[PDB]
Design an enzyme around this catalytic site. Structure first.
Site, PDB file in Angstrom:
ATOM      1  CD  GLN A   1     -21.480  12.159  22.956  1.00 58.35           C
ATOM      2  OE1 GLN A   1     -20.759  11.403  22.864  1.00 58.35           O
ATOM      3  NE2 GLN A   1     -21.604  13.010  24.007  1.00 58.35           N
TER       4      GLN A   1
ATOM      5  CG  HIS B   1     -23.465  16.575  19.907  1.00 55.34           C
ATOM      6  ND1 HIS B   1     -24.334  15.242  19.902  1.00 55.34           N
ATOM      7  CD2 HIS B   1     -23.421  16.773  20.892  1.00 55.34           C
ATOM      8  CE1 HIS B   1     -24.685  15.000  21.233  1.00 55.34           C
ATOM      9  NE2 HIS B   1     -24.255  16.121  21.843  1.00 55.34           N
TER      10      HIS B   1
ATOM     11  CG  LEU C   1     -36.545  11.866  18.344  1.00 52.91           C
ATOM     12  CD1 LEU C   1     -35.471  11.054  18.000  1.00 52.91           C
ATOM     13  CD2 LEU C   1     -37.545  11.898  17.327  1.00 52.91           C
ATOM     14  CE1 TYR C   2     -29.603  10.053  17.135  1.00 50.75           C
ATOM     15  CE2 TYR C   2     -31.133  11.083  15.780  1.00 50.75           C
ATOM     16  CZ  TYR C   2     -29.994  10.006  15.930  1.00 50.75           C
ATOM     17  OH  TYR C   2     -29.379   9.209  14.897  1.00 50.75           O
TER      18      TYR C   2
ATOM     19  CG  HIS D   1     -28.114  11.030  28.002  1.00 45.58           C
ATOM     20  ND1 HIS D   1     -29.018  12.123  27.531  1.00 45.58           N
ATOM     21  CD2 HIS D   1     -27.067  11.512  27.344  1.00 45.58           C
ATOM     22  CE1 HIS D   1     -28.454  13.137  27.392  1.00 45.58           C
ATOM     23  NE2 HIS D   1     -27.068  12.865  26.980  1.00 45.58           N
TER      24      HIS D   1
ATOM     25  N   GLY E   1     -38.689   9.394  14.468  1.00 48.18           N
ATOM     26  CA  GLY E   1     -37.197   9.676  14.314  1.00 48.18           C
ATOM     27  C   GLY E   1     -37.164   9.539  12.693  1.00 48.18           C
TER      28      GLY E   1
ATOM     29  CB  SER F   1     -33.577  10.196  10.649  1.00 42.60           C
ATOM     30  OG  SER F   1     -32.051   9.972  10.662  1.00 42.60           O
TER      31      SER F   1
HETATM   32  C1  HEM Z   1     -19.650  10.380  27.702  1.00 44.78           C
HETATM   33  C2  HEM Z   1     -20.809  10.527  26.906  1.00 44.78           C
HETATM   34  C3  HEM Z   1     -22.036  11.446  26.971  1.00 44.78           C
HETATM   35  C4  HEM Z   1     -21.928  12.604  28.002  1.00 44.78           C
HETATM   36  C5  HEM Z   1     -20.914  12.876  28.966  1.00 44.78           C
HETATM   37  C6  HEM Z   1     -22.963  13.643  27.788  1.00 44.78           C
HETATM   38  C7  HEM Z   1     -23.417  14.663  28.516  1.00 44.78           C
HETATM   39  C8  HEM Z   1     -24.439  15.269  27.581  1.00 44.78           C
HETATM   40  C9  HEM Z   1     -24.503  16.803  28.389  1.00 44.78           C
HETATM   41  C10 HEM Z   1     -23.698  17.431  29.498  1.00 44.78           C
HETATM   42  C11 HEM Z   1     -25.340  17.470  27.530  1.00 44.78           C
HETATM   43  C12 HEM Z   1     -25.948  19.068  27.832  1.00 44.78           C
HETATM   44  C13 HEM Z   1     -27.136  18.854  28.746  1.00 44.78           C
HETATM   45  C14 HEM Z   1     -27.632  20.116  28.509  1.00 44.78           C
HETATM   46  O1  HEM Z   1     -26.988  21.199  28.099  1.00 44.78           O
HETATM   47  O2  HEM Z   1     -28.738  20.354  29.045  1.00 44.78           O
HETATM   48  C15 HEM Z   1     -25.860  16.439  26.398  1.00 44.78           C
HETATM   49  C16 HEM Z   1     -26.860  16.866  25.663  1.00 44.78           C
HETATM   50  C17 HEM Z   1     -27.084  16.007  24.534  1.00 44.78           C
HETATM   51  N1  HEM Z   1     -26.904  14.504  24.253  1.00 44.78           N
HETATM   52 FE1  HEM Z   1     -25.254  13.742  25.566  1.00 44.78          FE
HETATM   53  N2  HEM Z   1     -23.877  12.932  26.721  1.00 44.78           N
HETATM   54  C18 HEM Z   1     -23.049  11.725  26.308  1.00 44.78           C
HETATM   55  C19 HEM Z   1     -23.509  10.698  25.332  1.00 44.78           C
HETATM   56  C20 HEM Z   1     -24.566  10.996  24.307  1.00 44.78           C
HETATM   57  C21 HEM Z   1     -24.961  10.038  23.216  1.00 44.78           C
HETATM   58  C22 HEM Z   1     -24.226   8.757  23.013  1.00 44.78           C
HETATM   59  C23 HEM Z   1     -25.881  10.470  22.561  1.00 44.78           C
HETATM   60  C24 HEM Z   1     -26.427   9.786  21.436  1.00 44.78           C
HETATM   61  C25 HEM Z   1     -27.198  10.499  20.543  1.00 44.78           C
HETATM   62  C26 HEM Z   1     -26.135  11.799  23.200  1.00 44.78           C
HETATM   63  C27 HEM Z   1     -27.213  12.619  23.076  1.00 44.78           C
HETATM   64  C28 HEM Z   1     -27.303  14.183  23.141  1.00 44.78           C
HETATM   65  C29 HEM Z   1     -28.075  15.039  22.702  1.00 44.78           C
HETATM   66  C30 HEM Z   1     -28.896  15.132  21.100  1.00 44.78           C
HETATM   67  C31 HEM Z   1     -27.905  16.417  23.284  1.00 44.78           C
HETATM   68  C32 HEM Z   1     -28.518  17.809  23.119  1.00 44.78           C
HETATM   69  C33 HEM Z   1     -27.726  18.876  23.259  1.00 44.78           C
HETATM   70  C34 HEM Z   1     -27.601  19.942  22.085  1.00 44.78           C
HETATM   71  O3  HEM Z   1     -28.652  20.381  21.651  1.00 44.78           O
HETATM   72  O4  HEM Z   1     -26.602  20.431  21.899  1.00 44.78           O
HETATM   73  N3  HEM Z   1     -25.340  12.160  24.184  1.00 44.78           N
HETATM   74  N4  HEM Z   1     -25.173  15.388  26.877  1.00 44.78           N
HETATM   75  C1  LIG Z   2     -34.750   2.980   7.714  1.00 38.13           C
HETATM   76  C2  LIG Z   2     -35.720   4.120   7.953  1.00 38.13           C
HETATM   77  C3  LIG Z   2     -37.224   3.626   8.302  1.00 38.13           C
HETATM   78  O1  LIG Z   2     -37.535   2.565   8.896  1.00 38.13           O
HETATM   79  O2  LIG Z   2     -37.896   4.191   7.443  1.00 38.13           O
HETATM   80  C4  LIG Z   2     -35.203   4.661   9.455  1.00 38.13           C
HETATM   81  C5  LIG Z   2     -34.560   5.796   9.220  1.00 38.13           C
HETATM   82  C6  LIG Z   2     -34.254   6.586  10.680  1.00 38.13           C
HETATM   83  C7  LIG Z   2     -34.610   5.961  11.825  1.00 38.13           C
HETATM   84  C8  LIG Z   2     -34.102   6.728  13.017  1.00 38.13           C
HETATM   85  C9  LIG Z   2     -33.077   7.597  12.923  1.00 38.13           C
HETATM   86  C10 LIG Z   2     -32.549   8.055  13.964  1.00 38.13           C
HETATM   87  C11 LIG Z   2     -33.418   8.385  14.934  1.00 38.13           C
HETATM   88  C12 LIG Z   2     -34.734   7.408  15.036  1.00 38.13           C
HETATM   89  C13 LIG Z   2     -35.078   6.710  13.966  1.00 38.13           C
HETATM   90  C14 LIG Z   2     -35.302   4.761  11.835  1.00 38.13           C
HETATM   91  F1  LIG Z   2     -35.425   4.068  13.110  1.00 38.13           F
HETATM   92  C15 LIG Z   2     -35.687   4.008  10.603  1.00 38.13           C
END
Ligand code: HEM
Ligand SMILES: C[C@@H](C(=O)O)c1ccc(-c2ccccc2)c(F)c1
Ligand code: HEM
Ligand SMILES: CCCCCCCCO[C@@H]1O[C@H](CO)[C@@H](O)[C@H](O)[C@H]1O
Ligand SMILES: CCCCCCCCO[C@@H]1O[C@H](CO)[C@@H](O)[C@H](O)[C@H]1O
Ligand SMILES: CCCCCCCCO[C@@H]1O[C@H](CO)[C@@H](O)[C@H](O)[C@H]1O
Ligand SMILES: C[C@@H](C(=O)O)c1ccc(-c2ccccc2)c(F)c1
Ligand SMILES: CC(=O)N[C@@H]1[C@@H](O)[C@H](O)[C@@H](CO)O[C@H]1O
Ligand SMILES: CC(=O)N[C@@H]1[C@@H](O)[C@H](O)[C@@H](CO)O[C@H]1O
Ligand SMILES: CC(=O)N[C@@H]1[C@@H](O)[C@H](O)[C@@H](CO)O[C@H]1O
Ligand SMILES: CC(=O)N[C@@H]1[C@@H](O)[C@H](O)[C@@H](CO)O[C@H]1O
Ligand SMILES: CC(=O)N[C@@H]1[C@@H](O)[C@H](O)[C@@H](CO)O[C@H]1O
Ligand SMILES: CC(=O)N[C@@H]1[C@@H](O)[C@H](O)[C@@H](CO)O[C@H]1O
Ligand SMILES: CC(=O)N[C@@H]1[C@@H](O)[C@H](O)[C@@H](CO)O[C@H]1O
Ligand SMILES: CC(=O)N[C@@H]1[C@@H](O)[C@H](O)[C@@H](CO)O[C@H]1O
Lengths: 552, 552
Positions: free
Chosen positions: A172, A176, A353-354, A357, A495, A499
């Protein structure tokens, strides 16, 4: 109307309308030809008969631990393999970019405008009869319905791979800096104009903001001491805009420089660690360079931390989530004799894809206590009470949830997951199968092949009706996991390419930058080349708490 | 103080301070090693004994007209040669960029900040004892003195190559989309954030501006008809900000989209031509695509005009100024199997070297009449009186001045030429010899070797005292011309690499973009691949006036 709606062109050929009711395919450089780019050239037929499937390759990579153990100790081979993974993944991304929310044809606005997330497949024309072009009903299934039937969590499902909370919060925190949707504009617009790993989440997106977080002494970031411990400075001290609910006491409004990071102690934890790391690298650089002033100390440190981040992201984070026995390598030199573009643009689909949650637990266990979402959110006092050490210790101990496999999205964030479905559609994403085809996967022939089970599949077939109309986002969370894995095929095959481009396409990985002087000498260069998630916590956290992205 | 002031590191190695009074060289990837990167590796010794000098290669390229004539008709060879010129020039530029006015070490601010012109050699540290580091007197010679003694023009000196005013105004029009100094900021800051050939000078730098210039019908640019002729619209009609003296009648304030282009009828001429060309391409695209709306017609046209520009800039403009008998080629595919970065960043030094004011005559002869600067400046009524045809005809007929060779800067623009000296120094440029070394030239050992004559050389030696302290800007204009040439060695050996990167490092030259569909199909693609300065004038100008960058 738009004759291109049916997405007729195959194998990455481009479709163009040639009159109101006819189309043409540009089969250039695809290895195919014919009306749809479906019929292979000769060498293509051979490449196809020799391309092991993703799952085949995945098996080989997660078994034979004895053999890999040997390979991992033959540099000539490890390098040779890593090089291949890097190049073969990358040729999957368009660089320079093309297509965005508003442009399904190639256009200069699309290329020049850094405010858009780019797009791996063009959007579906606004005047197509159905949302996915031609297949399916006038309207996609009710998002609330899909959410509730296949996404939401009944019973918490732990990740079989041992991903802990260190892993979930690092994911996260890290992502971000380059997923920063600009809601004033719409989904599909980003606020991170760096489009990659530039550490703006530590240093700030603008110059004006960075200066406010800066100490202007020894290259350091401003900080405060509470207990005997280093934490970021206050919004009051720095005047940097941060997002906090109005009820938050002034001395708990931390700065850090990604405005959103105050809303979760797990984020604020890493923010602190990295801030500590920067000032640590500064003290090091100042010793090797008594003649250096404040600016160069700061600038060089930021370059080093960028290195550290990529080093760690590849060799620990990716290493872990991959499940591979092969030991991945961060080595820019692997690319110096290859065709590769040292640039990058973050794709909307990567963002989509990322959204992992499912990783989140039902309560946050900061060894001793158990906090609910309501307790945890925007509550830094928790961080202060326990300290960094407890936290690392606690978060290393707690398993995160499995992502694929369906029905694991915490009810606490259901609004988010629904939003994901809704905005996917708002942005006119193509079908799951179209993205699979786009990434050299074989499309799914039934909801049952997608999930690998019977119940959720039947539920989906009742809503979508036709596999070819299954949406990308839901499918990812619902997809049959690889054996004892956290993700399914689709997640990993979309991904990795996104990535690795974002990782290796960083200027510091380019020949001009990748040399000791860039980082203040052999001593700073080492800081990058020996970095690990373990040492990051070791050098900066009070005890020397053991960590891992892995619940042991 | 700064131990790096003496620019001790050679062969492109980087110098870093290692304590107040010592330094170290990063010899990485240079092909050399040793305290200064002066001692060659083995393969380097060989490459050196086989590298023909610039002048040798230049002789071969401008003689043997009979042999070239044969090579030019063997595709396999022409391509093989062009490929070589492209790759070998390019490896001379840092891409991604490094260094700018404020950063002599590598830094992220330097990389990320698109507002700076980048810099081929780092600036001289603010705390070096002399302006050029260590050599020379506390102060550089009086700029007024250098200007008057060796720069200003006594008797007009025509270019022996036949460059006419079509050539001179094309150069000015073309380069002014990427040389756009932001004087609010300082020299060394640009306003053209596209850093390359994006046709912002036709379409506008911002979205807001482009919309004001647009017709929103058939993809076309707004225009007016005067006589029976097409000219750009008025500032009054469009509200687009333009720079005009307050005395200019409202109906003569033309829009065009590079705000500065109203100040010279030669600029306003091309602006009109290109505007006509855009709307011409739109009528074409509308015929092949009745289903296309306004936006895609416009966007596709701009992509085509970008192609036309690069096609013309390489095969006519560069062709001419080079003097080569070899027929240069614009063919993106020549690079598809090579290492090459499809990105670019315009260098301060490229801006500096491209100040070709010696090209200007003493009077502008628009066949019939002879205008002085005062008459010509910001005077579009001239353009209206004569029409485009007379103008093309007249400007094709008039020789421009020789650039190198000294003493040819028109008195009318002496303020500019002095500025160039002054701003060079303000931006802390290194010495002429340092830039020569940087581009694989052998440094000059005497002012007399630089000019190839006795008088100006003695004059210079009296001011600078030491050849190693000769400034880059003046040297370029004063340098001994290649035989019957318009430029000397330095101009061409710095210029080409900068020029070709900016040309080929354009997204449309990248594999994803370089295909018919990108340009609306085979018919639009052709518009690019057959473009010439001649046909540009032919398709858009009332007669079909013969043109050339060449006074016949
Ligand atoms: C306590 C932990 C977390 C909370 C409270 C939370 C909550 C949220 C909230 C409120 C949003 C905004 C949604 C919107 O604006 O429509 C968001 C977006 C998002 N979250 Fe989480 N989340 C958590 C953990 C995580 C984790 C561990 C990941 C791991 C990748 C993640 C990935 C994302 C991503 C990629 C977005 C896209 C938002 C952007 O483009 O800025 N979140 N989350
Ligand atoms: C090690 C490498 C690969 O397998 O080519 C790789 C790189 C990035 C990821 C990845 C990283 C973030 C989101 C989704 C996939 C993966 F699963 C594997
Ligand atoms: C009537 C013809 C011309 C006039 C009146 C003129 C005058 C000027 C002026 C006033 C400036 C800006 C001065 C400043 O910003 O300090 C300038 C800049 C410049 N000129 Fe010209 N010039 C003419 C022709 C040309 C031509 C033919 C070239 C060919 C390359 C050229 C190349 C340049 C360049 C590269 C700059 C710096 C661009 C920038 O950073 O804005 N000029 N000239
Ligand atoms: C088997 C061990 C060495 C090879 C590891 C390759 C890592 C990634 O290989 C992937 O496999 C897929 C199917 O073949 C392809 O679609 C991808 O393009 C490719 O990147
Ligand atoms: C997280 C639980 C609340 C929302 C679910 C209600 C809407 C439909 O959920 C249903 O309930 C069961 C869940 O185990 C399943 O057996 C059904 O197949 C599923 O459709
Ligand atoms: C006989 C050669 C035919 C023409 C090809 C040469 C294209 C440009 O050759 C140039 O020569 C210079 C000195 O060798 C170098 O500075 C450059 O690396 C190179 O681009
Ligand atoms: C033909 C080619 C080359 O010699 O490599 C070339 C390219 C660009 C230029 C050029 C272009 C603009 C300014 C200065 C030089 C050149 F003089 C020669
Ligand atoms: C040669 C060929 O396969 N033609 C196909 C056609 O059958 C199909 O109707 C169309 C739409 O997808 O694509 C094309
Ligand atoms: C986008 C950005 O940060 N641009 C900065 C600008 O704001 C600053 O005033 C100037 C000083 O270096 O440098 C540039
Ligand atoms: C955001 C920021 O710090 N900008 C300031 C601005 O006041 C100044 O004029 C400019 C120099 O070009 O950069 C600095
Ligand atoms: C808003 C909220 O839930 N309040 C919590 C409280 O329950 C808890 O005692 C404290 C821990 O320091 O964090 C705060
Ligand atoms: C081995 C070598 O060439 N070292 C030289 C040193 O002798 C000289 O004093 C200096 C001058 O810049 O450059 C370095
Ligand atoms: C720098 C730039 O051109 N940004 C544009 C912005 O004006 C516009 O709001 C948006 C919608 O097209 O796209 C982006
Ligand atoms: C999507 C978005 O940001 N829309 C803006 C729009 O409101 C504004 O009028 C225009 C001006 O360029 O830029 C675009
Ligand atoms: C600015 C200026 O000197 N005015 C000129 C004028 O002398 C000339 O006769 C006329 C021809 O159209 O162009 C205008």
């Amino acid at each position: 109307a738009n004759p291109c709606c049916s997405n007729p062109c195959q194998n990455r050929g481009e479709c163009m309308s040639t009159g109101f009711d006819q189309y043409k395919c540009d089969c250039t450089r695809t290895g195919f030809y014919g009306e749809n780019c479906t019929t292979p050239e000769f060498l293509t037929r051979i490449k196809l008969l020799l391309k092991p499937t993703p799952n085949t390759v995945h098996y080989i990579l997660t078994h034979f631990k004895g053999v890999w153990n040997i390979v991992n100790n033959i540099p000539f081979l490890r390098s040779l393999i890593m090089k291949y993974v890097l190049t073969s993944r990358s040729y999957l991304i368009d660089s320079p970019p093309t297509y965005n929310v508003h442009y399904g044809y190639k256009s200069w606005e699309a290329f020049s405008n850094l405010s858009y997330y780019t797009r791996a497949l063009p959007p579906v024309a606004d005047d197509c009869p159905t949302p996915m072009g031609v297949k399916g009903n006038k309207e996609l299934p009710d998002s609330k319905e899909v959410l509730e039937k296949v996404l939401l969590r009944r019973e918490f499902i732990p990740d079989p791979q041992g991903s802990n909370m260190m892993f979930a919060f690092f994911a996260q925190h890290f992502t971000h800096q380059f997923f920063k949707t600009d809601h004033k504009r719409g989904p599909g617009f980003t606020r991170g104009l760096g489009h990659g790993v530039d550490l703006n989440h530590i240093y700030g997106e603008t110059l004006d903001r960075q200066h406010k977080l800066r100490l202007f002494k020894d290259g350091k970031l401003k900080y405060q001491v509470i207990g005997g411990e280093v934490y970021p400075p206050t919004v009051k001290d720095t005047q940097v805009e941060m997002i906090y609910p109005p009820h938050i006491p002034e001395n708990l409004q931390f700065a850090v420089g990604q405005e959103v990071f105050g809303l979760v102690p797990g984020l604020m934890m890493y923010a602190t660690i990295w801030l500590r790391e920067h000032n640590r690298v500064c003290d090091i650089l100042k010793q090797e360079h008594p003649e250096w002033g404040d600016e160069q100390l700061f600038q060089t440190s930021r370059l080093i931390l960028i290195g550290e981040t990529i080093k760690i992201v590849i060799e620990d984070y990716v290493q872990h989530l991959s499940g591979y026995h092969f030991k991945l390598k961060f080595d820019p030199e692997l690319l110096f004799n290859q065709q590769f573009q040292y640039q990058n643009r973050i794709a909307s689909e990567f963002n989509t894809l990322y959204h992992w949650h499912p990783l989140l637990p039902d309560t946050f266990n900061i060894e001793d206590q158990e906090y609910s979402f309501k307790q945890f959110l925007y509550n830094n006092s928790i961080l202060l009470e326990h300290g960094l050490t407890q936290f690392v210790e606690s978060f290393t101990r707690q398993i995160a949830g499995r992502v694929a496999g369906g029905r694991n999205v915490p009810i606490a964030v259901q609004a988010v997951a629904k939003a994901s479905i809704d905005q996917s559609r708002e942005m006119k994403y193509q079908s799951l199968n179209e993205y699979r085809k786009r990434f050299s996967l074989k499309p799914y022939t039934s909801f049952e092949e997608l999930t690998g089970e019977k119940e959720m599949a039947a539920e989906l077939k009742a809503l979508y009706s036709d596999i070819d109309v299954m949406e990308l986002y839901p499918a990812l969370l619902v997809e049959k996991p690889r054996p004892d894995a956290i993700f399914g095929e689709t997640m990993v095959e979309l991904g990795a390419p996104f990535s690795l481009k974002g990782l290796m396409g960083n200027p510091i990985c380019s020949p001009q930058y990748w040399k000791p002087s860039t980082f203040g000498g052999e001593v700073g260069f080492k800081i990058i080349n020996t970095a690990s998630i373990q040492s990051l916590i070791c050098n900066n956290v009070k005890g020397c708490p053991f960590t891992s992205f892995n619940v042991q």
